[PDB]
Amino acid sequence: MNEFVSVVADQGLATLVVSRPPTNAMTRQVYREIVAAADELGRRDDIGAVVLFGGHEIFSAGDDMPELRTLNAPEADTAARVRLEAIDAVAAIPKPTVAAVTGYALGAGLTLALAADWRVSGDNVKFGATEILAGLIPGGGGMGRLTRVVGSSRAKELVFSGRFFDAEEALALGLIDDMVAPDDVYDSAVAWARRYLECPPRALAAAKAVINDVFELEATERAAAERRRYVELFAA
Amino acid sequence: NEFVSVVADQGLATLVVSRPPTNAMTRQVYREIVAAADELGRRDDIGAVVLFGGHEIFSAGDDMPELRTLNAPEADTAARVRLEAIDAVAAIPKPTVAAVTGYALGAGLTLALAADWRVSGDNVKFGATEILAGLIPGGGGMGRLTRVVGSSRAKELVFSGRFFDAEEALALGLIDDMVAPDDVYDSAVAWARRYLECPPRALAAAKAVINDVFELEATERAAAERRRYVELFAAGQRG
Amino acid sequence: NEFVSVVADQGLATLVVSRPPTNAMTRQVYREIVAAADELGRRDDIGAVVLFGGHEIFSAGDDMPELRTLNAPEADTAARVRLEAIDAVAAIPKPTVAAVTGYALGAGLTLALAADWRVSGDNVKFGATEILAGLIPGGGGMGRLTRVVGSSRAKELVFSGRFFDAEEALALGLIDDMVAPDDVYDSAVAWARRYLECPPRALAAAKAVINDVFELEATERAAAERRRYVELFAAGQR
Numbered sequence: 089m090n091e092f093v094s095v096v097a098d099q100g101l102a103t104l105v106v107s108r109p110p111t112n113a114m115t116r117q118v119y120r121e122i123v124a125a126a127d128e129l130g131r132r133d134d135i136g137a138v139v140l141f142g143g144h145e146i147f148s149a150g151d152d153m154p155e156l157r158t159l160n161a162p163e164a165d166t167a168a169r170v171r172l173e174a175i176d177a178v179a180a181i182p183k184p185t186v187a188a189v190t191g192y193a194l195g196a197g198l199t200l201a202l203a204a205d206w207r208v209s210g211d212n213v214k215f216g217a218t219e220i221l222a223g224l225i226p227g228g229g230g231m232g233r234l235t236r237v238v239g240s241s242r243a244k245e246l247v248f249s250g251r252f253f254d255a256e257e258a259l260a261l262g263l264i265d266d267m268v269a270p271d272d273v274y275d276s277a278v279a280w281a282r283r284y285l286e287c288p289p290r291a292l293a294a295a296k297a298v299i300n301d302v303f304e305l306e307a308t309e310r311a312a313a314e315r316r317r318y319v320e321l322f323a324a
Numbered sequence: 325n326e327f328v329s330v331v332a333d334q335g336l337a338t339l340v341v342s343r344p345p346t347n348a349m350t351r352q353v354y355r356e357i358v359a360a361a362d363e364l365g366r367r368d369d370i371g372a373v374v375l376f377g378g379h380e381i382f383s384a385g386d387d388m389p390e391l392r393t394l395n396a397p398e399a400d401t402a403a404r405v406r407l408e409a410i411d412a413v414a415a416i417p418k419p420t421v422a423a424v425t426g427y428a429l430g431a432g433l434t435l436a437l438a439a440d441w442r443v444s445g446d447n448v449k450f451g452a453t454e455i456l457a458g459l460i461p462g463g464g465g466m467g468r469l470t471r472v473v474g475s476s477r478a479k480e481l482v483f484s485g486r487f488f489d490a491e492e493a494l495a496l497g498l499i500d501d502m503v504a505p506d507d508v509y510d511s512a513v514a515w516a517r518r519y520l521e522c523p524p525r526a527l528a529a530a531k532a533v534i535n536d537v538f539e540l541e542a543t544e545r546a547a548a549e550r551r552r553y554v555e556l557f558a559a560g561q562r563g
Numbered sequence: 564n565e566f567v568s569v570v571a572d573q574g575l576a577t578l579v580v581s582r583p584p585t586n587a588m589t590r591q592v593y594r595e596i597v598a599a600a601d602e603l604g605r606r607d608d609i610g611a612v613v614l615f616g617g618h619e620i621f622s623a624g625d626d627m628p629e630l631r632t633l634n635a636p637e638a639d640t641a642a643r644v645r646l647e648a649i650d651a652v653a654a655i656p657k658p659t660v661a662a663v664t665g666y667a668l669g670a671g672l673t674l675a676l677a678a679d680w681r682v683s684g685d686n687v688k689f690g691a692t693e694i695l696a697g698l699i700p701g702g703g704g705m706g707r708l709t710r711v712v713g714s715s716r717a718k719e720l721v722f723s724g725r726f727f728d729a730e731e732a733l734a735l736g737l738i739d740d741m742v743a744p745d746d747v748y749d750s751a752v753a754w755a756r757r758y759l760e761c762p763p764r765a766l767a768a769a770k771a772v773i774n775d776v777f778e779l780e781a782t783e784r785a786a787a788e789r790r791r792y793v794e795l796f797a798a799g800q801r
Contacts, residue, residue, distance in 0.1 A: 161558045168550045184722060205718050223523045224556050225530045225549070232545065235537045237713060239472060241500055244440050247530045248419060248519060265715055284722055288697050295699045295721045302709040302717075304542050307778045310706060314699070315642045321698050323635040399796035403789050458762045460769045462792055467784065470776045474711060476739055479679050482769045483658060483758055539781050 093121035095128055095135075101281050102135040103188075104178075105142070111149035112142045114196055116167050118152075119174040122200075126177035136289060137281035138185040140178070140204050141274060147187070147213075150195025153222055168227050171196065175228035179203040179300065182293035184284040188277030190270060194218045194252075198263075199230035202237070205296065207263070208277045210270040214252045215263065221250040236303055237262050291321055328356035330363055335520050336513065337370040339413075340377070346384035347377045349431055351402050353387070354409035357435075361412035371524065372516040373420040375413070375439050376509060382422070382448075385430025388457050403462050406431060410463035413438040414535060417528035419519040423512030425505060429453045429487075434465035437472070437498070440531070443512045445505040449487045450498065456485040471538060472497050526556055567595035569602065574610040574759045575752065576603055578652075585623035586616045588670055590641050592626075593648040596674075600651035610763060611755040612659040614652065614678050615748060621661070621687075624669025627696055642701050645670060649702035652677040653774060656767035658758040662751035664744060668692045668726075672737075673704035676711070679770070681737070682751040684744040687729045689737065694724040710777055711736050764800060768792065 092108040104125050106112045114122075129138050142148055151171070159167060178185070178200065187193075187204035195218045201207050217234065219226045226234075226247060235243040238261050246253070258264040268276045284292060294317035301310055327343040339360050341347045349357075364373050377383055386406070394402060413420070413435065422428075422439035430453045436442050452469065454461045461469070461482060470478040473496050481488070493499045503511045519527065529552040536545055566582040578599050580586045588596070603612050616622055625645070633641060652659070652674060661667075661678035669692040675681050691708065693700045700708075700721060709717040712735050720727070732738040742750045758766065768791035775784055794800055 156557070157561075160561075161554060164557045165550065165554050168553050172546060172550070184718075206715055220523065220526050220530060223526050223560050225526055225533060225553055227549065227553050229546065229549070231530065231533045231549070232537050235534055239497060240534055240537070241441055241497070243534050244419075244531065245500075247534065248522060248527055262713060262715070287694065287722060291694050291697055291699055292722055295694065295705065296718065298699065298705045299709055299714055299717050299721065302706050302714070302777075306541075306780050311646060311703065314701065314703070314705070315639065315646070318642050318699055318701050319635055319639045322630075322633075322638045394796055396793050396796045396798070400789065400793045403792050407785065407789075455761065455765050455769065458765050459795055460765050460772065460792060462788075464785070464788070466769065466772045466788070467776050470773055474736060475773055475776070476680055476711075476736070478773050479658075479770065480739075482773065483761060483766055541780060 089121050089124035091121065092118050093125045095125050097132070097134050100134070100285050101137045101139065101278065102129055102132070103139045103141050104129060106148060107143060110146070111192070112146055112197070113149050113152040115152040115155045116170060119167075119170045122174040123170070123177050126174070126181055130182050135183065136285045137183050138181055139274070139277045139281050140185060140187045140200070141277070142190065144190055144270070144274070146191035147189045147193045148197030148200060149192055150197045150218060151227070171228045175199055175203050182296065183289070184281060184292060184296070186277045186280045188274045189213055189264065190273050195226065196228055196230065199226060199228045199233060202230070202233040202263070206265045206280060208266045208268065208273055208280060209255045209258060209264040210273045211255050211267050212270050213255045213258070215255070215258050216250060216252045217247045218250045220247060290324065294318070294321060326356065327353050328360045330360050332367070332369050335369070335371050336374065336516055337364055337367070338374045338376050339364060341383060342378060346427075347381055347432070348384055348387040350387040350390045351405050354405045357409040358405070358412045361409070361416055365417050370418065371520040372418050373416055374509070374512045374516050375420060375422045375435065376512070377425065379425055379505075379509070381426035382424045382428045383432030383435060384427055385432040385453060386462070391459065392457070406463045410434055410438045417531060418524070419516060419527065419531075421512045421516045423509045424448055424499065425508050430461060431463055431465065434461060434463045434468060437465070437468040441515060442499040443501045443503060443508055443515060444490045444493060444499040445508045446490050446502050447505050448490045448493070450490070450493050451485060451487045452482040453485045455482060467538075525559065529553070529556055564595065566592045567599045569599055571609060574608065575613065575755055576606070576609045576611070577613045577615050578603065580616045580622060584620070585666070586620055586671070587623050587626040588648075589626040589629045590644055593644045596648040597644070597651045600648075600655050604654070604656050607763070609657065610759040610761075611657050612655055613748070613751045613755050614659060614661045614674070615751070616664065618664055618744075618748070620665035621663045621667045622671030622674060623666050624671040624692060625701070645702045649673055649677050656770060657763070658755060658766065658770075660751045660755045662748045663687055663738065664747050669700065670702055670704070673700060673702045673707060676704070676707040676737070680739045680754060682740045682742060682747055682754060683729045683732060683738040684747045685729050685741050686744050687732070688726045689729070689732050690724060690726040691721045692724045694721060706777070708737075764795060768795060
């Protein structure tokens with residue numbers, strides 16, 4: 089499960105590398121490989137934090153549309169389920185994760201970036217919810233993740249139009265956390281990730297878990313899970 | 325029939341509330357908004373919608389002389405039809421823009437928030453005025469306000485009932501653009517026309533999923549997103 | 564009784580936490596916060612509340628030395644009473660303002676966030692410090708932090724446990740006003756007094772619905788909003 093996606097470990101941190109030139113367009117196979125990569129990263133104790141990276145040229149132009157056009161409805165349905173499984177798995181990695189975004193983050197590419205805990209972006213990057221340009225809509229929970237950061241009205245403007253927005257606008261909207269020169273994206277992402285290597289890993293995992301649940305779970309379930317995680321940490 | 329109209333022109337409709345002098349909305353006005361919102365969803369001569377109260381005023385909100393005379397079961401019914409009207413407008417499966425002039429107060433602000441976007445006159449006054457009559461905002465107003473501005477600001481506005489100007493509304497994210505009073509309707513029409521050439525079934529599905537973000541539990545949200553995605557995809561293969 | 568005090572003055576009450584030198588909250592302080600908050604909610608002669616730890620400090624958070632003497636089931640019970648205290652303050656059916664001086668750290672930051680508004684000294688340090696003890700914020704802190712600042716910033720703050728100043732809190736939306744250290748209490752009082760002549764039933768119902776926005780599932784929200792709205796028309800409540 090690693091023709092296009094690889095996990096590269098180095099000095100306590102790992103890079104999940106998507107490499108499917110020239111746009112890192114994600115086919116069904118790429119999504120399966122992201123699922124396996126996310127699982128591997130969660131369990132590896134030589135890895136304390138993760139950088140998501142497509143290479144210096146591009147993060148991802150999104151779904152592979154030509155593949156999609158060859159599928160029938162049940163195959164497309166399965167593709168949509170694996171897409172969500174991939175995006176969720178990346179979001180749930182029990183370690184701090186940063187998207188090192190270069191070139192373009194479009195459609196499912198933007199959704200993938202939004203699954204990371206933080207995003208460091210090149211100042212030349214173009215973003216966009218391009219799915220509507222194919223007569224489709226964003227999958228993998230993209231519209232939900234977008235909406236919680238920018239609000240409904242802006243979410244609709246971006247998704248309905250499918251327009252490109254620059255890194256400066258992404259920064260102003262809160263969709264990326266830092267903007268740097270194109271040659272420094274990966275190195276800045278690595279530096280952000282390294283900031284957490286000396287933290288208690290189970291506590292980070294627990295904090296991430298509760299934070300991510302804030303918009304997902306009903307209040308009683310949120311409280312039960314927070315308390316359980318707190319007591320666990322305490323009992324260890 | 326009586327206070328709310330749908331006026332279609334060049335592919336676009338204006339949903340017009342007209343109940344002088346303040347476009348105060350009674351129970352009847354809300355029922356008429358529900359009928360107008362359903363009509364607008366069904367009509368294929370209509371690709372996008374502008375909500376409009378006329379050049380003078382959008383709406384001062386609930387009709388307080390009516391509300392003040394109701395008992396608890398009548399208030400229950402009033403609260404339902406108000407919510408039904410706001411949600412109907414919110415669910416219109418087409419891009420919708422509020423062309424806000426004069427005032428958007430109480431249920432009037434809520435109605436404006438039910439549009440996808442708001443273009444406001446620079447002289448408009450906004451406010452959650454319900455508490456000035458001893459009441460609270462209905463129609464899910466407090467939720468829609470809170471999700472845009474956060475709890476602390478939502479409370480300050482709703483507890484005080486104070487008026488705020490269009491500059492503050494813009495800074496709070498409660499409106500999307502501010503223009504001269506005489507240009508509000510025309511600018512609203514121009515924002516609405518920007519989407520007339522989009523794929524209508526995809527827009528409808530996108531709008532539906534975005535609106536469901538705060539309305540459905542996570543499993544139901546993911547299922548509905550996938551179903552809509554697959555329907556769009558199958559339809560385009562077929563013809 | 565021992566660490567938490569209620570002081571009333573023409574419609575305005577101050578809930579005072581005093582457990583020097585840091586107003587660290589032990590299990591007993593949380594029980595006392597619960598009882599004081601409930602009392603304040605009941606009292607119809609009180610139209611608003613200021614939360615205050617004195618001129619020097621709001622709270623440095625959980626009493627960690629107490630916590631280190633507990634076993635896991637006791638810690639579980641401690642965690643439930645912590646939540647009960649935060650929620651009790653959040654649910655006070657009257658406008659409430661936190662007069663934050665000195666430090667608001669860990670459960671102390673959570674407590675300030677339970678108030679409707681926060682007026683802070685410009686020299687105050689804030690922080691989600693629980694991770695520095697190998698723990699995580701309790702009392703629903705992470706949820707309350709996340710709704711204001713968003714996930715990405717919530718994580719940065721909670722994962723690091725770093726201190727942030729009043730200027731950064733203001734820019735993040737975590738406090739509503741920043742004033743000189745000597746003016747915190749007075750400004751909190753003036754803010755609270757602005758609402759003393761509002762219709763109390765309507766404030767209560769509005770506060771309850773606004774707080775439920777992130778607490779209840781959508782069908783439960785619509786039902787509870789409608790119930791509270793209709794109550795304003797009920798025979799005994801007009």
